[PDB]
Design a protein around this ligand. Sequence first.
Ligand code: CA
Lengths: 45, 615, 43
Amino acid sequence: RRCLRRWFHFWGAPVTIFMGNVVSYLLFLLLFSRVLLVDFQPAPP
Amino acid sequence: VDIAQSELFRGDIQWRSFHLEASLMDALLNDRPEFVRLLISHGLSLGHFLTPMRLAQLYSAAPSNSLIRNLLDQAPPDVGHVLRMLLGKMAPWSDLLLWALLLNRAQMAMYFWEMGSNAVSSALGACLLLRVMARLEPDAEEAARRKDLAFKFEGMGVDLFGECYRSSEVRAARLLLRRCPLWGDATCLQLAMQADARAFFAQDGVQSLLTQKWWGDMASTTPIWALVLAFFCPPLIYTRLITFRRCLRRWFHFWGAPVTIFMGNVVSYLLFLLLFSRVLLVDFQPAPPGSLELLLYFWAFTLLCEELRQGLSGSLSQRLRLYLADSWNQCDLVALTCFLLGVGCRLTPGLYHLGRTVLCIDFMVFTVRLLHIFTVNKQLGPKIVIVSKMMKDVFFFLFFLGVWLVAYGVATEGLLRPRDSDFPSILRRVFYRPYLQIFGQIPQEDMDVALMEHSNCSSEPGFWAHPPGAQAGTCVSQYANWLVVLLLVIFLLVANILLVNLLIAMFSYTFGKVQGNSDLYWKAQRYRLIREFHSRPALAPPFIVISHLRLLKEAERKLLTWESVHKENFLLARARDKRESDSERLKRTSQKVDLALKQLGHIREYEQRLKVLER
Amino acid sequence: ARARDKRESDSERLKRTSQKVDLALKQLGHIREYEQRLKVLER
Ligand SMILES: [Ca+2]
């Protein structure tokens, strides 16, 4: 289908993968700090 | 082509216009600059030659799906509409030159401009057209050729004008530029402004011309201090201090000069800020606005009305857009808008504080706008431009620093485990406090456990210390405190030395690189400034209101001939210079040698035949 | 294009020009000898 073809075309482009990866990476750090500064406790995780 | 002149035009054969008409057409369609030059050189009546049908043929000869074809398709050449569209809808040679430019036949255009009439005006016009064409060109490679050709014309136009300027200063400068152009209405300079012909404005002649317009009727050599004394002593103008009914004529001459309007405006602007601060720091109160606050509101309203006039008289959408283009006009608009919000919030019963806050920021915008003054001085204008080009380095430093601050800030906070752990404070200790450490504010007693009391705060296992700082956390762990100090050492090393020094290195390199271009850019922008103040009403902003309320042939033939003669002389000198260059002499010398070798062979053959006949 | 560019360089023209001169000098000598022989035969 044309719609599916365009969808993969956009989401398969190297740039979009890069940007998508970057956004995920930032959230990872933000999650990391949240865990490290607050959620980290001697109790079980 | 050399063969044709050698053989077809050896002189042994006559020729006729009709004979050469077909060949000329072929050369034009096939882009044969040498031939078209040669054919015209042979006494061809171009004016009687060109026909509208032929002209249509040329345009039809555009290459395949060339950009020009797209414009023609969207647009019987109908060229006039095309140009009117490209610019914005604000003698055979001229037509041929226009045609050559559209098809990007560099040599063809170059030759036609040489035979043209309005050489200087045409040169800039070509420079404008190509740059617009290249910007719109999608090929992304033809644009490179168009950009190159544009530079060639601009370089040629400036070279010609310099010759004209030297020959007859008053003649060229005044009449040759200030006059209205051909194929357009905006003066010749405006064409340069549209084309962003940095080099052209960079020329000495125009700069001298602009300076003359900048000072208006007053002599361009008037000392600045002398102007200031005159400004504060209006009667003083009539003395011999300023070099240029008679009294009224002189009065308007002095007060109408662009420079005096600028200085008068600057003095008013400073007083505006001084009034602003007086209101902001003292007179601002929750009570209804006082006398001064009202005066400021009226004063600001005058600024708003003034800036409105600028945009309204920069094609409503066209003039609005170009007015918005100027960065300073953007600064004015944002400044005024914030001012309205401040007053609006100020009047509302419940938003007095918010009103004051936004005004304080607004005042910051107005003060920053004051940097426009430094764009006048020739030793500061270039500096301001260069500063604009440093933003690339600053952003690099910020992003690099921002990464490091997050890396160090979070790690330090993680080790300490402060008990406050309140989100606003967390941000303070993660970003703020580390940031200040760059500038010598290093709170050792808030991070080094050795400098803090030991006390029991939380039942959590491990040891704890009580920092004295109010925002340093009630109690911070001390498990691996040596690591915290170690990071502090690393952080200072990286941020406080490596990055800051690296930034200085980038500025040193960037400043050296863009010093040349920045100087040209300022010189070009100098015109835009002068035009802006040339049309501004004489009175100052606080009193500008009244001005707003009050607001509510053969010589040309002689001039053109004068232009052409210098162009012809300029080309001949350049062409002769080429012929006298070493390489050309070497080429011509070698050819003569071959001719000599040829005759030597013939002589040698003659001797042999004579020797045989000696019997 | 590169090879032609080299052949059109100034140095190469100078080299080729000098060689042609020597050839011209050679023929001049032969012509000079021819004139001498003809002059002798003029008797
Ligand atoms: Ca303005």
